[PDB]
């Protein structure tokens, strides 16, 4: 980001990044779509039971995920900066409450500032 | 590209001093306008937190969070003692030999 103080303001506000990374929704080999109509298509392929989930992605965005490989939920098909909502939904409360603290602690670690994770954790809880 | 050959004791010439004022300004200016925004940040923080008070002795949950040292790259940025000290264990830590206390 900027980053610094504005960065800290951005993290506590859960602001969507410029070019977000998207996250897989369930385990299973990934599947491709029809063609480039507007952006592109991407078909989720769950392995065993309910397998109707789907999403749409722009072909301008490069891809990183493997094609015929199994990919669990919360994996990076696309490199980029992550968003708190996505982490919370695809990983859980503890994963996101750890991401927030670990990321907001880097800007304070850069400057000689030391604060226990407890206060950031109470803020994340709120 | 044209560095400051002189040290403060020898004395600066006009050109190098003028070059230095460039970085001097951003430093002075950054402190003044940051004063306004830091207040906004801390104010929002106090606004989102006030009513939260320590109200109970114990919750009775083993959930907690897993505390592991921040070992980034080659070495550690902060040991585990510092990220664990002052807090309470969620479950019985065993000796590295499993099944102990």
């Amino acid at each position: 980001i900027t980053g610094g103080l504005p960065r800290v303001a951005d993290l506590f506000e859960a602001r969507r990044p410029k070019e977000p990374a998207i996250l897989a929704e369930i385990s299973g080999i990934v599947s491709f779509g029809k063609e480039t109509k507007g952006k592109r298509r991407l078909v989720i392929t769950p392995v065993d039971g309910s397998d109707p989930y789907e999403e749409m992605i722009p072909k301008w965005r490069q891809l990183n995920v493997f094609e015929g490989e199994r990919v669990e939920r919360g994996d990076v098909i696309s490199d980029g900066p992550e968003a708190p909502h996505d982490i919370l939904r695809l990983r859980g409360v503890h994963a996101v409450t750890r991401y927030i603290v670990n990321e907001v602690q880097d800007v304070y670690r850069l400057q000689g500032v030391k604060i226990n994770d407890k206060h950031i954790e109470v803020i994340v809880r709120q | 590209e044209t560095p400051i050959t002189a040290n403060f004791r020898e004395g600066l010439n006009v050109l190098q001093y003028f070059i230095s004022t460039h970085g001097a300004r951003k430093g002075l200016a950054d402190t003044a306008l940051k004063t306004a925004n830091s207040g906004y940040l801390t104010r929002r923080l106090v606004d989102v937190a006030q009513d939260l008070v320590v109200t109970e002795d114990d919750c009775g949950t083993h959930e907690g969070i897993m505390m592991t040292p921040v070992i980034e790259g080659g070495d550690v940025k902060e040991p585990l003692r510092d990220r664990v000290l002052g807090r309470v264990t969620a479950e019985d830590v065993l000796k590295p030999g499993t099944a102990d206390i």
Partner: peptide, 17 residues
């Protein structure tokens, strides 16, 4: 070493180089 920012040290510019 610490954003100053007048001169750089290793990764960023700094108040003291």
């Amino acid at each position: 070493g610490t954003p100053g920012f007048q001169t750089p040290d290793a990764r960023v510019i700094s108040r003291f180089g």
